């Protein structure tokens, strides 16, 4: 299940709402997809698991949902610390990551 | 607090092998599997494989089958990943992460993700001195 | 209490991505571990949590020889059939519990996991059977059921039915028709050394 993400780079000001897309070449179970955040110089951290469930320690401004072949990560407002590269993952078939989206 | 730490950076010749350690604490070691993810400079994340800390069962990404061997020491709660026949394009940071995508005991898929990541071990492969 | 360091794999039983159909329920054996139940009976995520022969708040200091986790998916209205002494299409043809059942039945709503708009027909149950099941008996035969007086010979038709039916699970169904994930923890103590003990 090849995952792709769009846009490659998402240009938004602080305080704006960010929408990050992830698409699958095949249907992905709604419970087998996750989102990660990687800040410059740091290891990735888990933000969302099970498509919509927020991971422990993650701010409530981070949310998401999806089904079928179309999943979305939503950031209700961009904070100074929310400018990072996000990745989508699925483990319905093997385990793969998407290309990654940079928020700038 | 759950913490994962790893070895320092290494420099290897082409054809050589690297064994990257992963020390973990702050949780029941044998309740969670361990995954490894590689990230070459400027690139995205690539899954290498998964190991059960309970029964030793492994699941490797096809690209790394025949090259990567994973082991676990449950007495020192430390994971290891050995990558053989290093190539010049294997230069990357190797991340160790706690796994909750596959059960450690029964091997079935779970609702979760790689919750806790390590610092990342940088491995450079070059013929240069 | 034997010196056991491994913890019981309840997580990977309750947090599994896929559950079995009720006609073909999946049994996982739990042994040689420390069973912490404080994460189950204190969990608000469960809609049903009933125990028979034991109090769930005094289950965290007892030692058992084995614990078996039987997992499957049924619709809301049929959750009441997962109990000792009960009868019905599920109790009689899919999953029967003994009158002296000891253990806990745990269930929760999974409408947002096991349903889709087009209808999730992956889950099935047995509708037709010649006789009732024995306690903890599993029957996954797909042979044609003869309702009438004539032989079917594997062919469907008048008074010849395929024994398994699908659940029409949809996100817009009323609660009684929404999918529930059920895990039954069957406890036993034999004249033997215990292998599953509480956290003490
Ligand atoms: C099935 O998975 C559930 C989700 O697990 C999470 O996601 C997976 C993918 C992994 O990343 C995993 O590591 C994640 O935790 C899992 O739910 C988890 O269950 C544990 C055990 O009960 C919870 O730990 C305790 O939570 C309570 C309640 O926390 C409140 O605040 C959080 C804020 O993050 C909310 O999200 C909660 O809903 C609550 O409102 C804490 O009070 C408690 O702390 C106290 O006890 C500990 C000792 O255990 C002490 O050290 C502390 O000092 C306190 O005295 C724990 O933190 C965990 O929070 C919960 N996850 C989430 C997100 O709530 C579920 O248990 C799994 N099912 C089975 C059978 O395992
Ligand atoms: C306690 O640990 C020892 C090993 O040091 C083991 O031989 C013994 O069987 C354990 N006790 C029980 C009841 O299992």
Domain of residue A5, residue span: 1-104
Cα A73 to chain centroid distance, Å, stands at: 5
Count of structural domains, chain B: 1
Q: Are strands A101-103 and A9-10 parallel, antiparallel or unpaired?
A: parallel
DSSP C175-200: GGGSEEEEEEEEEE--SS---EE---
Residue with tokens 């209808």: C119
Q: What is the DSSP letter of C11?
A: H
Answer whether A31 sits within 8 Å of C113, measured CB to CB. Answer: yes
Q: State in Å, rounded, how far the first CA of chain B is from the last one.
A: 41
Name the experimental technique.
cryo-EM
Count of structural domains, chain A: 1
C195 neighbors C32 (Cβ within 8 angstroms)? yes
Classified as helix, coil or strand, B88 is helix
Q: CA–CA separation, B115 vs C69, rounded Å?
A: 26
Spatial CB neighbours of C117, under 8 Å, sequence gap ≥ 6: C170, C171
Q: CA–CA separation, C65 vs C27, rounded Å?
A: 16
Domain of residue B69, residue span: 3-125
B50 neighbors B113 (Cβ within 8 angstroms)? no
Closest CA to A86 of A97, A76, A77, A95: A97
Verify cis geometry, omega within 30 degrees of 0, for the bond prior to C55: no
If you count them, how many residues does chain C have?
A: 200
Q: Is B35 exposed, middle or buried (0-12, 13-18, 19+ CB in 10 A)?
A: buried
Q: What is the resolution of this structure in A?
A: 3.3
Tokens standing for residue C108: 């929760």
Q: What is the CATH number of the domain that holds B120?
A: 2.60.40.10
Q: Is B73 in the pocket of ligand 1 (CB under 6 A)?
A: no
Closest CA to B113 of B104, B127, B102, B124: B102
Spatial CB neighbours of C83, under 8 Å, sequence gap ≥ 6: C50, C52, C91, C97, C101, C105
For B103, the closest of C5, C7, C12 (CB atoms) is: C12
Phi, psi of B108 (to 5 degrees): -100, 155
Cα C137 to chain centroid distance, Å, stands at: 12
Question: Sign of dihedral through CA atoms C10, C16, C21, C24?
Answer: negative
DSSP A30-89: TTSEEEEEE-TTS--EEEEETTTEEPTT--TTEEEEEETTEEEEEESS--TT--SEEEEE
Q: Is C85 in the pocket of ligand 2 (CB under 6 A)?
A: no
Kind and range of the H or E run holding C33: strand C33-34
- Please, what's the largest Cα pairwise distance for chain A? 37
Beta-bridge partners for B50: B35, B59
């Amino acid at each position: 299940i090849v995952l792709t993400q769009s846009p490659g780079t998402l240009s938004l000001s602080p305080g704006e709402r960010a929408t990050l897309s992830c698409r699958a070449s095949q249907t992905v179970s709604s419970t087998s997809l996750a989102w990660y955040q990687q800040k410059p110089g740091q290891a990735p951290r888990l933000l969302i698991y099970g498509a919509s469930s927020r991971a422990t320690g993650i701010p409530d401004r981070f949310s998401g949902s999806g089904s079928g072949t179309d999943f979305t990560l939503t950031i209700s407002r961009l904070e100074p610390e929310d400018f990072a590269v996000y990745y989508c993952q699925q483990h319905d078939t093997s385990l793969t990551f998407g290309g990654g989206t940079k928020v700038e | 607090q759950v913490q994962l730490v790893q070895s320092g950076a290494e420099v290897k010749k082409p054809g050589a092998s690297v064994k990257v350690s992963c020390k973990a604490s702050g949780y029941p070691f044998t309740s969670y599997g361990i995954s490894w993810v590689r990230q070459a400079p400027g690139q995205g994340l690539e899954w290498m494989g998964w190991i059960s800390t309970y029964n030793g069962n492994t699941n490797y990404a096809q690209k790394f089958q025949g090259r990567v061997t994973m082991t676990t020491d449950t007495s020192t709660t430390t994971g290891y990943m050995e990558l053989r026949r290093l190539r010049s394009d294997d230069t990357a940071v190797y991340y160790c992460a706690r796994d909750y995508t596959r059960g450690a005991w029964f091997g079935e898929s779970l609702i979760g993700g790689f919750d806790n990541w390590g610092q990342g071990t940088l491995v450079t492969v070059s013929s240069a001195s | 209490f034997p010196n056991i360091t491994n913890l019981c794999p309840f997580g990977e039983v309750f947090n599994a991505t896929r559950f079995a159909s009720v006609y073909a329920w999946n049994r996982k054996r739990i042994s040689n571990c420390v069973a912490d139940y404080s994460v189950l009976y204190n969990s608000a995520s469960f809609s049903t949590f009933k125990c028979y022969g034991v109090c769930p708040t005094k289950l965290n200091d007892l030692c058992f020889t084995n614990v078996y986790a039987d997992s499957f998916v049924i619709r809301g209205d049929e959750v009441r059939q997962i109990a000792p002494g009960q009868t019905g299409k599920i109790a009689d043809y899919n999953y029967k519990l003994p009158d002296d059942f000891t253990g806990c039945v745990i269930a929760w709503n999974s409408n947002n996991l096991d349903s889709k708009v087009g209808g999730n027909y992956n889950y099935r149950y047995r509708l037709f059977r010649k006789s009732n099941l024995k306690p903890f008996e599993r029957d996954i035969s797909t042979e044609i059921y003869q309702a009438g007086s004539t032989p079917c010979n594997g062919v469907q038709g008048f008074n010849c039915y395929f024994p398994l039916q699908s659940y029409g699970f949809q996100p817009t169904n009323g609660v009684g028709y929404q999918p529930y994930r059920v895990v039954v923890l069957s406890f036993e103590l034999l004249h033997a050394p215990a292998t599953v003990c509480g956290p003490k």
